[PDB]
Amino acid sequence: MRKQMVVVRAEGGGGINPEIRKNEDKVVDSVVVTELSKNITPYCRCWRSGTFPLCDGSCVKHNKANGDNVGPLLLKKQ
Amino acid sequence: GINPEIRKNEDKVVDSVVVTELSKNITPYCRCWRSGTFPLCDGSCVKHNKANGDNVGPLLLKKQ
């Protein structure tokens, strides 16, 4: 959408992940659950985190800008 | 927007998993907000990806 080479990604389209790992056929991440170190580890469901697949709070910025309500998955040891 | 309809009465939709409670060897959790079994993945991602030229997929929680 909007070619200047540079493609400006204007508007919407149907997608939800404009930027992350676009070279991958399908972005899947795996967690072997015994590898968790903290009691609670938040995982990103918004495709905006700078530490994706972890949540860095970018969801907060996305929600306010877009009138959305997404948030992370909390993996808990206990 | 990312989430069309899930739990709009919540200003921020968060789910928790106590990993010792998982039953399947690999349990897929939805990151696309299209699953009919959200927060689980039911493969709606695949249809979404095809329809919208996207490449999103689940988080897989594995025992081994």
Ligand code: FES
């Ligand atoms: S940064 Fe994506 S869910 Fe928090």
Ligand code: FES
């Ligand atoms: S149904 Fe949403 S990630 Fe598979």
